[PDB]
Amino acid sequence: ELFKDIKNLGKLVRLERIFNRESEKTVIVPMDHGVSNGPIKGLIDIRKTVNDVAEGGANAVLLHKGIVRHGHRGYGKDVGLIIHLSGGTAISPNPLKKVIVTTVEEAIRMGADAVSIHVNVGSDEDWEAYRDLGMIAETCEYWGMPLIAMMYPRGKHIQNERDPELVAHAARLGAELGADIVKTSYTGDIDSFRDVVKGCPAPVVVAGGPKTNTDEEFLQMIKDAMEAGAAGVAVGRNIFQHDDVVGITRAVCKIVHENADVEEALKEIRK
Amino acid sequence: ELFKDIKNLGKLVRLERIFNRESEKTVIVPMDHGVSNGPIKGLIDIRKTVNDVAEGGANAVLLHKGIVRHGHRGYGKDVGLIIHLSGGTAISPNPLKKVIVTTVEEAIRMGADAVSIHVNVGSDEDWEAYRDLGMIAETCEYWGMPLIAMMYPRGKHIQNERDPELVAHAARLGAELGADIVKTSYTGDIDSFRDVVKGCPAPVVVAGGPKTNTDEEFLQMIKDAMEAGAAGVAVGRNIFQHDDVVGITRAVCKIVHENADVEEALKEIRK
Amino acid sequence: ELFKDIKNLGKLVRLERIFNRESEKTVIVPMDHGVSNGPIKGLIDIRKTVNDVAEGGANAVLLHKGIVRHGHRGYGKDVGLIIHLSGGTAISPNPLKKVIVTTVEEAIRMGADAVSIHVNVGSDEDWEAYRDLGMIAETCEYWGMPLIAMMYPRGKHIQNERDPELVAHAARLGAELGADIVKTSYTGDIDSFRDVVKGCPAPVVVAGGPKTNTDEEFLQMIKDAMEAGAAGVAVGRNIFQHDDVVGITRAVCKIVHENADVEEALKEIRK
Amino acid sequence: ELFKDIKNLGKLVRLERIFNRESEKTVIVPMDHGVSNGPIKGLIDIRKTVNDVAEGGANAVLLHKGIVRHGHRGYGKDVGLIIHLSGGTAISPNPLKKVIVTTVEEAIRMGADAVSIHVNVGSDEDWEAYRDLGMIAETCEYWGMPLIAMMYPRGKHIQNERDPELVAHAARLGAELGADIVKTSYTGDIDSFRDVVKGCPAPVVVAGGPKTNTDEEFLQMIKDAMEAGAAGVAVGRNIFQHDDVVGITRAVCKIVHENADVEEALKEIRK
Amino acid sequence: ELFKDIKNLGKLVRLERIFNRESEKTVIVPMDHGVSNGPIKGLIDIRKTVNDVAEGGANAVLLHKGIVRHGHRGYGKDVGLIIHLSGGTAISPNPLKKVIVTTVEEAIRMGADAVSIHVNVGSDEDWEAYRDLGMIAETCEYWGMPLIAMMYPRGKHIQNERDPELVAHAARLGAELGADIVKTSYTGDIDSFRDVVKGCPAPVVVAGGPKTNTDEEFLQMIKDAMEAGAAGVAVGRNIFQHDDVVGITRAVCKIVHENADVEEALKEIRK
Amino acid sequence: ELFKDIKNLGKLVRLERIFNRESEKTVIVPMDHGVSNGPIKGLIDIRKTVNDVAEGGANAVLLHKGIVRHGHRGYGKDVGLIIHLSGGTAISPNPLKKVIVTTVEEAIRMGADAVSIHVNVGSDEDWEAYRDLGMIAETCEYWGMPLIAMMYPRGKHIQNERDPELVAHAARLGAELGADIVKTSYTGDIDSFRDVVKGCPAPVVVAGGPKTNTDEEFLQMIKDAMEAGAAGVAVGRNIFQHDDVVGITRAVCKIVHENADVEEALKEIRK
Amino acid sequence: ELFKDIKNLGKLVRLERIFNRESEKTVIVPMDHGVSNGPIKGLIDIRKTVNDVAEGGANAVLLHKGIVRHGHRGYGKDVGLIIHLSGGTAISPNPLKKVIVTTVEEAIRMGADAVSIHVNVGSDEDWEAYRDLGMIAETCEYWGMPLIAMMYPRGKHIQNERDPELVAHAARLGAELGADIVKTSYTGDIDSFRDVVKGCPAPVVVAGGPKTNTDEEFLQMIKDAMEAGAAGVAVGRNIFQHDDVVGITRAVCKIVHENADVEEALKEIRK
């Protein structure tokens, strides 16, 4: 079993709604860009992007409390709901600054299945975030709320945010502080990323990154990441900014849940 | 209708006192300049100005707490009361700094129908305000208190505070964090502003701006803003600093509630 | 439909896990007898029973905190979890006395989808329970936790606990105080029960009762109850004390979710 | 001038939604019988009854938190919402026992304009209720929530619950403890009731009682009560159990708001 | 293992100090009689009784906080500490009345490894204790403190406190409410007690009772109890009031931890 | 009249102890210089200065908590007590920095009749003080404690702290944030100060300032200030550092309470 | 006996699980490097390292809460658990910055036997840490939780972090503020370190430091440190990054618990 070591009935129950019973993997679609980047392609009509993506395979979605109270359909099949707790914007005089904008209690009373926090390890006064992650991890432990920690090496003195050692360190940091799952950048090659995965006691979900050149490159990255040990993927733009949202997620699901090869999943992108 | 998603009995009930049942639009008159600018034309005799626009069919007013305890008419059209929670002054060594000076509880025990907060996205340590908006959004959700978030792109590195992308981003930011209604600057043209409106999940009320030159210009801006998708307007100086407060508000109400044109509107200004 | 007028996101989300999307009905299996009656046939091996009732249709189970942390399938058909908050025993000098033994917070941090309380209207100092139901309804409203109120007319001066008037009163009492769903005894005939259903603003789930003499009689009662307006059934002993737990629940599900008749239902009972 | 000694901005604002600006009187329709008596004629379809009486011109209704989530309309004319805090039933082993079942905070976050409590002065351990009224009055004072205290002389040693001295005492008791408005039985004659009114510092609203037999008798009682000094009436059954709900309330409103005599009034009831 | 279903790191860690790693059984020596019966043979010199019993093989000792602050050896053999939370005396006008006299927090800050509560199911107002057990179970769950619930069928209408059905019910009651371990009377025969054990989801520890006649009868009862399914024994008087405390406990440990037989057990008693 | 729109029983009652019933004006003597300047002429023997300033007419003094426990008498004429909440010293690396050093609760439990706070609008991080004034205003509103806000335009970029526009702004700021009374510098001429008075919704008390070299000059300023609209004066040094404390206050009282002319007044200074 | 003065029952009980009864010394293995340095040799497979170090005779391990949730076993000699409360990373823009990331309460509900905090005396704003240590010392005193303060002289103006005077000062600082045990660097020679030990009222545990060149040098340092007065050692890398973890710890235990000599102890390390 994947989480067969966590002493928390509540966490298990809720983790069951974000991971696939059979594959023990997960396909999460982050849709929180509205806060940091503003209205972007694909995130204007949330209910559309959400319902589709669900129809395409996704296990759960990532959203800010302000947007949940809206994009609720309860129509098509159901996907897990992860509420983001961090805030920060590009237009801010310090883009890397992240602050807690939502409480764990708020998320649970909204019916969320998990909460996520973003930590830019290496940014100015990032230690304040260490404390945040640490304290939030505790309230999460109490409420039986699964916590996803998105750890990224970003700051003034960091040129390569994908450096293997830094990413491995950041991921471990999140597990050490109490996160149940860790989100982070793929290092570029199967071997270095495998180090990130083996160096972190908690399941690691890989980030998709900016919109890729070809669906083959993108789908290949995910394939490699999985073969390295990832417990799933958390793709945003590469999915909802695609021409065929339903199809592209189908591909991702094929690769992640069915171990299907790239050449195959690629035939799902029906125009 | 308007708030089709809002799932909070208390908020609905109170929103009914700030929006027009028939038009589903709103005319709000901000009268909080006393804190940031001091005693200015039109705000010396509050009870006069209140009932002035209130008589002009204004739905609600926006006062600070230390004035409402004074500004209590008892006559003239019962208008909604919105209590401002933010504070900051021009005489401060940092004019863009906004701080919470009133709690949501205080506002509700004063019989307010809604509360408003000001966020200068892009200013120094603006992330502190993100947290404020986020946390206040939650207490508002709890007390069933409608929250109006006035989002403005202002800061050291922002030359054009009316830039379409920045304004659209700021507006979205407010909705994402839990605001029920968003106040913001009109971008200048119907098309760009329409992007602001469509990019924000919550109703958007447009700001009037400092006193303009000719009324036609002013009434035209409001007309364009409405045709772009605004759910109403929040005009301050352009109304209470006018020669005919009652008439100018009548004009605004004509345009906003009855969809009249500029020519028609002006006909209500007796001077 | 069933729930349109519940303006609370958390409750909706959780109610989706106890009601059938298509039929808008529910089959609940109470397994809390351990507290009031002790170890009885069918409740010795909980994981077996809960599993049996699960891989056979039930959309949820009712247990006490100290049993959830025990019998947890985790491998099979996912059923909803309802945590009981009331306590009382037959061996007590006052069997009708019910007390709160578990808090709503405990239930939510265990991943429960709803909580239930038992109120013996008419028993000694039953007003204490009115307050309990009232206060608990509030904390439930806050946490977005669906509340099932099991209302029963029981006490010294009540000969017929199935009297139509009393039952209708008790059901209404529960809804008036804030319950989202009401559990109660079937009055005996379709017409009187229809009065209970129409007199109560909230969905009414009918109780199965102690062992009926035959499966046809039992299945007929459920059939009549549904035709009267019940939103589902909450059967305990009649199901887990049956010779074919999986089959008998199949029958109940057939009648409740598929409006199937009884001859077609009786067939489900694999004997 | 009705409320002068009220120095509670919040209370004033909210009282404006339950009293008529011009007549300074009020017509309240209690619809809380569901808790104490069960489903009765007129209270089965709440949304129907609420609309009709509101069309009648009635200023406000009195419900229980359970029903509010079942009486929102946004259909026709809006009426004030008073949330009842007390609970007790006829089926209880002690019908005169009243307990707090809802908090003042709950009521305000639901958008209520006032709260009411029932006190059976003279019943067993009624002193517990004195404390309740006393403490609730304080929380009401804090939240700016108008409090209606329904004071009744009921108990083992009280034969005549309409006795002038007892009723006058009970009314005074409510005002002394902090209630803003007092509900009570009409003593039978204009002179004795005038004593109740003059002996109580707070406005007194009279109760309708059960169905007197003929329109005239009922409307006469209200007429006499008003002439005695009542600040309005709180009629339940006599109105919603009538054949012409809209008309009968029209009559009551005529007498209470327009000082019309019974002859003119009855002209409103289309029978 | 014994606690396979226990998901709680803190409870596991502490349970390791009261149970034998190899046998997964436990020998507890209750020394709380001081409160209910006063100074009795064997409990006058606590530190003495505590090390001889610890020399023999005791795994834990039960004591009221006031005794704990005294009998600390720091030499001998380290045993688990269980702090009793209940209180009641024989000299009381109601001996069966038990009240919480110590909080869970007090126990944990004293370094206790577990807490115990006594519940006389069937006594006057025993429902008050149901609530106590329920609420205490929750705080125990929070602090990761193992809870031992001593359930006994005692009251006015109970002639046989050792009745199989009653004892099985009482035991189940404790597990249902959240206890981790249950203390109770041996029913008399291996078969009936086996029903108690199988009807209770939590490990069951058997009570020794009053000094039965010989070391053979006593040791036989323990032998039978173990063969029935007991997870250990909690013997008080039969051990510390014995002539050879160290030896008699040795015997008990032999039977409980090594499955030995009464014969090769008596060999422990140094006459 | 004066305290007209104010709706707070507690505030009214206490304001009656700092204002003269007949003139509706007030003479306050600040004696808090000990904190910011150290022991200065006149403040060494507090009880002396406080008995003198009392006899001369004063209606209330102003001290820090640690001095009230000194200037208490009973032997003489009673005066109001105002407890200062702000702290800051000249010897500090930032003299304009003011911090809350005493809570409102402390003041009320000392029998204070009002509290005061100092705000240097325009100083470094003065927004922190805005929040302080704002929050304190609320606790004051709750305890029915009159709040005097001493608003001064002081900071790096302010050359003229007596500038009419700045002072009028600062005064308005205090009222807007919830102060009941405002303390501030006299602008120099009757006309500009009249603007400060009319631009501020709350009564304005004028500061005496540094001891000017003529009594006529001093008494003239007070005379002009009163004729401009001041509700009283708050003179420190000009009074207690005078040769005839009793006489000089007599003069001030003559001018402020009896509308004397600067001539009859001077006939109070015997010295 | 060691902790003779300590008058804390809870602390004593727990200290018994980290110190050896006979030698009154302790061998602690810090495994918290994951947070500050990332995944390093020896810390990838925690359960492995932990049960091997445990097998070697170490008393307690020390890790962050996030990691305790994984590496736990129900076999082998169970060692003490110390939960680290401080956080900080090498990748941070300020490596010497330490922040509280875990609360004392969290540690005790996880079954910890002690908590540790890291204080870099001399670093930027280190006074913030003084407060942390101080306040945490109090909560520890309350919960009966042993506190280990790791005091190190590190900062901009400190060239030699092993300077005798600085280390002695840092150690005393920890004891003065309430720590029960102090961790610190060995000064280099037996005489200077003896000053550190005698200048600190609390037992001092020495740090191992970086992986030494040879086993003899390392084991010699420990030998000297013990002969100077150390109450034990806290070795990290030198142990778990060794080729024979079980053997090297055996050596350390030999030297620390048996006073054996380096060479006899070196006879425990196998190739």
Amino acid at C208: G
Specify the number of domains making up chain A: 1
Looking at residue A206, the DSSP 8-state letter turns out to be E
d(CA F5, CA F11): 12
* Three-state SS sequence of F209-244: CCCCCCHHHHHHHHHHHHHHCCCEEECCHHHHCCCC
State the maximum Cα–Cα separation within chain B, in Å, rounded to a whole number.
Answer: 47
E235 appears as a binding residue in the annotation: no
DSSP assignment string, chain F: --S-S---HHHHHHHTTTS-TTT--EEEEE--HHHHT-S-TTSSSHHHHHHHHHHTT-SEEEE-HHHHHHH---SS---EEEEE-EE--TTSSSTT--EE-S-HHHHHTTT-SEEEEEEEETSTTTHHHHHHHHHHHHHHHHHT--EEEEEEE-STT-S-TT-HHHHHHHHHHHHHTT-SEEEE---SSHHHHHHHHHT-SS-EEEE--S--S-HHHHHHHHHHHHHHT-SEEE-SHHHHTSS-HHHHHHHHHHHHHH---HHHHHTT---
Beta bridge partner(s), residue D173: none
For chain A, which chains pass the contact test of at least 3 CB pairs under 8 Å? Answer: B, C, E, G
Q: Which of E176, E180, E196 to mutate to test the interface with C (most CBs of C within 10 A)?
A: E176
Contact residues, chain E, for C71 at CB < 8 Å? 201
Looking at residue B27, the DSSP 8-state letter turns out to be E
Looking at residue C73, the DSSP 8-state letter turns out to be -
| Angle of CA points B144, B146, B149, to nearest 5° | 140
d(CA D186, CA D161): 10
d(CA B79, CA B56): 10
* Three-state SS sequence of chain G: CCCCCCCCHHHHHHHCCCCCCCCCCEEEEECCHHHHCCCCCCCCCHHHHHHHHHHCCCCEEEECHHHHCCCCCCCCCCCEEEEECEECCCCCCCCCCCEECCCHHHHHCCCCCEEEEEEEECCCCCHHHHHHHHHHHHHHHHHCCCEEEEEEECCCCCCCCCCHHHHHHHHHHHHHCCCCEEEECCCCCHHHHHHHHHCCCCCEEEECCCCCCCHHHHHHHHHHHHHHCCCEEECCHHHHCCCCHHHHHHHHHHHHHHCCCHHHHHCCCCC
Asked if E10 contacts E143 with a C-beta cutoff of 8 angstroms, the reply is yes
Q: Which of A226, A154, A233, A148 is nearest to A193 (CA)?
A: A226
Region of C122 on the Ramachandran plot (φ > 0 left; ψ -120 to 50 alpha; else beta): left
Amino acid at C268: E
Instruction: Answer whether B70 touches F (CB < 8 Å).
Output: yes
3+ Cβ–Cβ pairs closer than 8 Å linking B and G: no
Asked if B236 contacts B63 with a C-beta cutoff of 8 angstroms, the reply is no
Please name the residues in contact with D265: beta carbons below 8 A apart, sequence gap of 6 or more.
D219, D251, D252, D254, D255
Q: Which of C4, C7, C8, C139 to mutate to test the interface with B (most CBs of B within 10 A)?
A: C7
Asked about E180 being catalytic, the answer comes back as no
Please name the residues in contact with G52: beta carbons below 8 A apart, sequence gap of 6 or more.
G245, G246, G249
Beta bridge partner(s), residue B80: B60
Partner-chain contact A130 G91, CB within 8 Å: no
Please name the residues in contact with D214: beta carbons below 8 A apart, sequence gap of 6 or more.
none
Instruction: Answer whether C44 touches E (CB < 8 Å).
Output: yes
For chain F, which chains pass the contact test of at least 3 CB pairs under 8 Å? Answer: B, D
Q: Which two tokens stand for residue A47?
A: 């209910």
d(CA E166, CA E153): 6
Radius of gyration of chain D (CA): 17
* Three-state SS sequence of E76-90: CCCCEEEEECEECCC
**Cα-to-chain-centroid distance, residue B116:** 8
D123 appears as a binding residue in the annotation: no
Question: What's B237's domain CATH number?
Answer: 3.20.20.70
Beta bridge partner(s), residue C182: C149, C204
* Three-state SS sequence of E4-26: CCCCCHHHHHHHCCCCCCCCCCE
Partner-chain contact E5 C72, CB within 8 Å: yes
Asked if F196 contacts F184 with a C-beta cutoff of 8 angstroms, the reply is yes
Asked if F199 contacts F165 with a C-beta cutoff of 8 angstroms, the reply is no
Q: Which two tokens stand for residue A190?
A: 């199967």
| Angle of CA points D128, D132, D136, to nearest 5° | 175
d(CA G33, CA A169): 10
Asked if D116 contacts D85 with a C-beta cutoff of 8 angstroms, the reply is yes
Q: Position of tokens 């409410």?
A: E177
Long-range contacts of F87-95 (CB under 8 A, 24+ apart): F87/F35, F88/F35, F88/F36, F88/F118, F89/F35, F89/F36, F89/F37, F90/F36, F90/F37, F90/F38, F94/F123, F94/F124, F95/F36
d(CA A167, CA E131): 50
d(CA G42, CA E206): 46
d(CA D59, CA E56): 81
Say whether D203 sits in a helix, a strand or coil.
coil
Q: Position of tokens 């098309």?
A: B191
B35 appears as a binding residue in the annotation: yes
Asked if E185 contacts E161 with a C-beta cutoff of 8 angstroms, the reply is yes
For chain E, how far is it from start to end, CA to CA, in angstroms? 37
Q: Which two tokens stand for residue F45?
A: 């023997």
Q: How many CB atoms lie within 10 A of CB C90?
A: 12
Contact residues, chain E, for G107 at CB < 8 Å? none
Asked if B69 contacts D9 with a C-beta cutoff of 8 angstroms, the reply is yes
Looking at residue A170, the DSSP 8-state letter turns out to be H
Instruction: Answer whether G109 touches E (CB < 8 Å).
Output: yes
d(CA A101, CA A91): 17
**Cα-to-chain-centroid distance, residue F69:** 20
Say whether D39 sits in a helix, a strand or coil.
coil
Q: Which of B115, B112, B106, B48 is nearest to B79 (CA)?
A: B112
Name the method of structure determination: X-ray
A204 appears as a binding residue in the annotation: no
Are β-strands F26-30 and D80-84 bridged in parallel, bridged antiparallel, or unpaired? unpaired
Instruction: Answer whether E70 touches G (CB < 8 Å).
Output: no
Nearest CA distance, B3 vs chain F (angstrom)? 32
Asked if E107 contacts G47 with a C-beta cutoff of 8 angstroms, the reply is no
Please name the residues in contact with A105: beta carbons below 8 A apart, sequence gap of 6 or more.
A139, A143
Q: Position of tokens 């009772």?
A: E209
Beta bridge partner(s), residue E120: E152
d(CA D46, CA C172): 12
Q: Which two tokens stand for residue G126?
A: 């280190």
Asked if D67 contacts C201 with a C-beta cutoff of 8 angstroms, the reply is yes
Amino acid at B120: N
d(CA G82, CA G63): 7
Looking at residue E142, the DSSP 8-state letter turns out to be H
Instruction: Answer whether B97 touches F (CB < 8 Å).
Output: yes
Contact residues, chain A, for C78 at CB < 8 Å? 16
From the candidates D152, D215, D223, D254, which is the catalytic residue? Answer: D152
Asked if D25 contacts D256 with a C-beta cutoff of 8 angstroms, the reply is yes
Q: How many CB atoms lie within 10 A of CB C225?
A: 27
3+ Cβ–Cβ pairs closer than 8 Å linking E and B: no
Instruction: Answer whether A97 touches B (CB < 8 Å).
Output: yes
Please name the residues in contact with D216: beta carbons below 8 A apart, sequence gap of 6 or more.
D262, D266
Contact residues, chain B, for A97 at CB < 8 Å? 127
Catalytic residues of C: 32, 152, 183
Asked if A224 contacts A186 with a C-beta cutoff of 8 angstroms, the reply is yes
d(CA A188, CA A194): 11
Instruction: Answer whether E9 touches G (CB < 8 Å).
Output: yes
d(CA G268, CA G263): 9
Q: Which two tokens stand for residue C147?
A: 């509340």
CB pairs under 8 A between C and D: 107
DSSP assignment string, D101-147: -S-HHHHHTTT-SEEEEEEEETSTTTHHHHHHHHHHHHHHHHHT--E
A134 appears as a binding residue in the annotation: no
Distances in Å between the alpha carbon of B61 and those of B82, B232, B240, C195? 6, 13, 11, 49
d(CA C35, CA E168): 11
Instruction: Answer whether B91 touches D (CB < 8 Å).
Output: no
d(CA D129, CA E119): 33
Say whether C77 sits in a helix, a strand or coil.
coil
d(CA B4, CA C228): 33
Q: How many CB atoms lie within 10 A of CB B191?
A: 11
User: DSSP E strands: which ranges in chain C?
Assistant: 26-30, 60-63, 80-84, 86-87, 99-100, 114-121, 147-153, 181-184, 204-207, 232-234
Please name the residues in contact with B108: beta carbons below 8 A apart, sequence gap of 6 or more.
B143, B145, D10, D108, D143, D144
Contact residues, chain B, for C142 at CB < 8 Å? 142
The number of residues making up chain F comes to: 271
Asked if C197 contacts C225 with a C-beta cutoff of 8 angstroms, the reply is no
d(CA C34, CA C19): 25
d(CA E120, CA B117): 58
Q: Give me the helix-helix angle, C164-176 and C190-198, nearest 10°.
A: 20
Instruction: Answer whether C37 touches E (CB < 8 Å).
Output: yes
Q: For A95-114, b where at least 16 C-beta lie within 10 A, e where not — what string? A: ebbbbbbbbbebbbbbbbbb
Q: Position of tokens 């007090």?
A: E106
d(CA D43, CA D33): 8
Q: What phi and psi, each to the nearest 5 degrees, are found at residue F233?
A: -135, 155
Asked if A130 contacts A160 with a C-beta cutoff of 8 angstroms, the reply is no
C164 appears as a binding residue in the annotation: no
Q: How many CB atoms lie within 10 A of CB A78?
A: 15
Partner-chain contact D102 C138, CB within 8 Å: yes
Query: In which domain, by residue range, is A1 found?
Result: 1-271
